[PDB]
Design a protein around this ligand. Structure first.
Ligand SMILES: CC(=O)N[C@H]1C(=O)O[C@H](CO)[C@@H](O)[C@@H]1O
Ligand SMILES: [Cl-]
Length: 424
């Protein structure tokens, strides 16, 4: 089974040290695949007919080798879907020269992406469909490798919603399933681009129409679409019972390399462990992550409980972490009335936990500014700044209610920020 990371998100490309770091993490998580396909690389997509430079190939072979050194396989992406005439011999040879330049460089693991297409088939073509054309084009690529290499296909309709709800209801998928060579794997992101859950019944349906088990392309931890947010919590919403229904697991992670330690650590635990539990898994990721938080000029590091807090604040796309969730729910239960009673123990307890949360966020903020690893600092600073401001606002508001102000009086002047603003 193919497992690992795709560098396939909308952001900056990683440096060579960053890719090397990510590769260590993937291998340590017991995963086996790294897929190269950054938007930085003009050859991947924007100008796909243009073969790599001598130096560009060199860079890729280097990555292949850094991955092989780690017990991982390395794939190269090609996205000839925007301006493709699927029947044109000039385009076909150009695709084939791309494939051949790589194949002969000894880079035979490929992804072919068809995610962004023209609304109608190009005149010099209208096969019966986009599906048949892409399928034919992809089979060509397969037949060119002569059974020595591997191809994964990213389809145009890659989640339930884009397939109309039930994937068995899509014609593109119907046709893709029957025309695409069975040696070629197909990506799927679940019922949505960013799926809150991916359930067994859903993937049974997908398997039927594609006539094969899909390779998961999981966007659970991606943050390109919302640069206001980052996801440092554990992989959630996918039961272990869906794994017999898949051909693979590729994570599309956060834009910033340093952000991805927990996403990779917990995904790998999900893949390896029958008893995977998100809260237990994030505890192990924190314990293994903490050494990256060494303080500058010092032997000490950010303490474990604060690293744990970081994950808790910036948890999942559809959930704040359990610790901050319960602290805010207890405060909500106490704000059931407009004027909390300062003497009430329930309000007293909620408030003190809120105030403690602020102290802890403030320590974490300050400590992060002092860490040796500046990239890790840069990765989190702004998210932490917002967290620290709106817990500040929440405490000032509740500190105000704790003075028994007369009613009528007015206060003088998914994730953490929004949860807080929802309470205001
Ligand atoms: C197959 C797929 O998911 N493609 C894009 C997408 O639509 O969603 C992700 C998260 O926004 C992006 O990083 C992907 O490049
Ligand atoms: Cl081009």
């Amino acid at each position: 089974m193919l497992t690992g990371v795709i560098e396939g998100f909308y952001g900056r490309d990683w440096r060579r040290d960053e890719r090397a770091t990510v590769m260590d993490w993937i291998a340590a998580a017991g995963m086996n695949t790294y897929i190269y396909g950054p938007k930085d690389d003009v050859h991947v997509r924007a100008r796909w007919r243009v073969p790599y430079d001598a130096a560009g190939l060199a860079r890729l072979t280097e990555l292949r080798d850094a991955a092989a050194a780690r017990g991982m396989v390395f794939y190269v992406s090609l996205a000839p879907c925007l301006d493709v005439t699927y029947s044109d011999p000039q385009d076909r040879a150009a695709l084939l020269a791309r494939v051949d330049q790589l194949a002969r460089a000894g880079l035979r693991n490929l992804v072919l992406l068809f995610d962004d297409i023209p609304s109608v088939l190009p005149e010099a073509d209208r096969f019966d469909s986009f599906a048949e054309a892409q399928a034919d084009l992809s089979n060509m690529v397969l037949r060119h490798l002569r059974g020595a290499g591997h191809v994964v296909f990213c389809p145009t309709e890659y989640c339930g919603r884009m397939a109309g709800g039930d994937p068995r209801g899509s014609a593109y998928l119907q046709r893709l399933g029957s025309t695409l060579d069975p040696a070629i794997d197909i990506f799927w992101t679940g019922p949505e681009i960013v799926s809150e859950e991916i359930v067994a019944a859903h993937l049974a349906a997908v398997g039927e129409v594609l006539r094969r088990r899909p390779v998961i392309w999981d966007n659970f931890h991606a943050n390109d679409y919302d640069i206001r947010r980052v996801f440092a919590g554990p992989l959630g919403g996918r039961s272990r019972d869906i794994l017999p229904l898949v051909a693979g697991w590729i994570t599309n992670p956060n834009n910033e390399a340093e952000a991805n330690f927990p996403a990779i650590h917990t995904t790998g635990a999900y893949l390896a462990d029958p008893d995977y539990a998100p809260e237990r898994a994030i505890a192990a990721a924190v314990a293994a992550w903490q050494p990256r938080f060494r303080l500058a000029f010092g032997d000490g590091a950010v303490p474990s409980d604060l690293v744990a807090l970081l994950c808790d604040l910036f948890w999942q796309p559809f959930a704040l972490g359990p610790e901050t969730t319960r602290i805010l729910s207890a405060l909500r239960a106490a704000l059931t009335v407009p004027r909390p009673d300062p003497s009430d123990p329930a309000w007293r307890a909620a408030l003190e936990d809120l105030r403690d949360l602020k102290r802890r966020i403030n320590k974490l903020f300050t400590l992060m500014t002092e860490i040796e690893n500046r990239d890790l600092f840069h990765t989190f600073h702004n998210y932490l700044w917002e967290a620290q401001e709106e817990v500040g606002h929440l405490v000032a508001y509740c500190d105000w209610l704790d003075e028994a102000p007369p009613p009528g009086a007015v206060f003088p002047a998914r994730g953490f920020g929004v949860a807080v603003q929802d309470i205001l």
